[PDB]
């Protein structure tokens, strides 16, 4: 016997659990979906309760964590984004990068809208972090889905 | 100055057609002359409200409240004990702390409500829990309203 007002925040707590649980468990492949492997997941979930930007960002995080060079790993992942279909991709990695001075490299290509609510609606985001020997690395992958049509995109046939 | 020209047609059937202040003072005089209730002496050494912090200094404030309580009872079909407190809520400056509204004392209004209950002007029933004024009180206040209206008219 709970209100709808408290019920929806209880549901918000449940989805707060679900987001991090999905992030932890979905590591070997992309986003295969959710249910309203599988047997264990359902058992644990019931016991406790009673084109893929995230996948590509996790792939790049794996390539950096395995000790592969950031430059080549980023170039490859950017090529896979371009061949996946996004008109561009904004990937930025930050940390120690082989030195004691903080630094970052920004790869710019294409339209690359970076602000505004239509931009936020059209563009999805991913930002991950992981440990390193003497610090922590931060990776941001901005993938923009193909455009309804953008108000700025104007053409007459 | 109290009477003002009116372009629309009046009805003059109840106190709703008469101004509040004139009626409440006229009925305070009426009850003072009729001696229907007591002063009472126990309310004399207590100020009107906690936020008031001072004596009202009029010697008839209890009778004015007695004339206004049923005035608001007619206006609202159902009221509460806190309704009078909120209606007569006053500024309270807690010294250095800033002003806030505060309700008046409830025992005095409870007591005068008991006084009119003994007078029979107000009745209580399980249905319509809020205070309402009885049918006899309706015609009594109607006659008194029309009785003041006729002198104040011409």
């Amino acid at each position: 016997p709970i209100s709808k007002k408290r019920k929806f925040i209880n549901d918000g707590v449940f989805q707060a659990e679900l987001n991090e649980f999905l992030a932890r468990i979905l590591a070997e492949d992309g986003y295969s979906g959710v249910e309203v492997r599988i047997r264990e997941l359902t058992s644990l979930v019931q016991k406790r309760f009673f084109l893929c930007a995230m996948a590509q960002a996790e792939s790049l995080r794996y390539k950096l964590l395995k000790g592969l060079a950031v430059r080549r790993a980023c170039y490859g992942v950017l090529r896979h984004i371009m061949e996946s279909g996004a008109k561009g991709c904004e990937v930025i990695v930050s940390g120690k990068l082989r030195a004691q001075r903080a630094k970052s490299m920004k790869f710019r290509d294409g339209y690359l809208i970076s602000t505004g609510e239509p931009s936020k609606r059209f563009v999805n985001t991913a930002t991950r972090s992981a440990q390193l020997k003497q610090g922590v690395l931060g990776i941001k992958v901005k993938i923009m889905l193909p455009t309804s049509i953008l108000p700025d995109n104007i053409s007459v046939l | 100055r109290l009477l003002e020209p009116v372009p629309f047609v009046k009805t003059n059937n109840c106190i709703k057609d008469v101004d509040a202040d004139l009626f409440i003072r006229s009925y305070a005089t009426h009850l003072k002359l009729h001696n229907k209730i007591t002063y009472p002496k126990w309310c004399t050494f207590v100020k009107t409200g906690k936020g008031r912090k001072l004596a009202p200094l009029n010697e008839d404030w209890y009778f004015i409240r007695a004339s206004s309580i049923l005035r608001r009872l007619y206006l609202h079909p159902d009221i509460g004990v806190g309704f009078l407190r909120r209606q007569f809520s006053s500024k309270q400056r807690r010294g250095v702390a800033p002003n806030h509204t505060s309700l008046a004392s409830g025992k005095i209004l409870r007591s005068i409500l008991q006084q009119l209950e003994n007078l029979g002007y107000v009745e209580q029933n399980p249905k319509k829990k809020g205070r309402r004024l009885t049918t006899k009180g309706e015609n009594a206040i109607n006659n008194f309203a029309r009785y003041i209206n006729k002198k104040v008219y011409n």
Binding site: - | E4, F8, V9, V18, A20
Partner: protein, 138 residues
């Protein structure tokens, strides 16, 4: 027969029911003179003169008061009664005088027939005042 119109300036609201009768222009329970402030009573009297006491003698207006300050309520009442008289002239009583009445109402001012959008804005940041800021130290 009957008409029901509305008037809202500021937070105050007003709904006016205009019906045939003997002139029972009543604001809910209380009359239009017993409000207490005569400054607003003059403004209430203002639309009555431009139309006609003899004309208003044949119609009853049921006026409801709910919310808003004194000035806001009087403005809402004025809008409600103006729309009521205009709609009643358009509908039932007479059309010939409706054009003259609305023309003179428009000429005298614009606030009598339709109110204003002027309202309170959401609070910005910087200070307690809606366009103030804290006294920054140095």
């Amino acid at each position: 027969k009957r008409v029901q119109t509305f008037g809202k300036k500021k937070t105050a609201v007003a709904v006016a029911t205009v019906t045939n009768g003997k002139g029972l222009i009543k604001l809910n329970g209380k009359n239009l003179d017993l409000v207490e402030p005569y400054i607003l009573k003059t403004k209430v009297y203002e639309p009555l003169w431009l139309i006609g006491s003899g004309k208003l003698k044949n119609l009853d207006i049921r006026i409801r008061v709910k919310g808003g300050g004194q000035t806001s309520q009087i403005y809402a009442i004025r809008q409600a009664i103006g729309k009521g008289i205009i709609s009643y002239y358009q509908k039932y009583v007479d059309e010939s005088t409706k054009k003259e009445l609305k023309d003179v109402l428009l000429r005298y001012d614009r606030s009598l027939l339709v109110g204003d959008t002027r309202r309170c804005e959401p609070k910005k940041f910087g200070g307690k005042g809606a366009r103030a800021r804290y006294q920054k130290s140095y």
